[PDB]
Amino acid sequence: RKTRKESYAIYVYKVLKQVHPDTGISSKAMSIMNSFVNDVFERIAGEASRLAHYNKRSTITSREIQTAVRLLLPGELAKHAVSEGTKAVTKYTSAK
Template identity: 85%
Template sequence: MAPKAQTPSKGSKKAVTKTSKGSTAGKTEKKHKRRRKETYSIYIYKVLKQVHPDTGISSKAMSIMNSFVNDIFERIAAEASRLSHYN
């Protein structure tokens, strides 16, 4: 029960600082929404679990696999572009 009592006090401190910053920042600058980075990680993970249900993957390995899929996709798109220009 003690950690729950501490959580609102931390939240209230953060809320006070946000309101003071928000009132000054709202007049001068607009906040831009961060663009979501699209990756193939969820699809790679689903396929991995289908093939090897008990195996996991590190974030570095997932990054490498994502780069691999992006590279292959770009190569296929480039080849499709070349083939379409022939006809």
């Protein structure tokens, strides 16, 4: 068998089933979504790293990610992403 490879395919499929209950996706579109997730990850992580470098701080935190999404995502997308991230952090800090 070939050496194992990573993918966001299962998580994309879970989100797809959550949103549209009975709609499937093809391999090309799954590859496109994988690349899109990788690209967004790269851009947000790079912005957070540059922020940490500028502020002379050696740690990446939720503040850094919030500032990065505000810088990168335009407008209402940024607002909704910030709200969703704050909710997730609150739930994680509470439940754990």
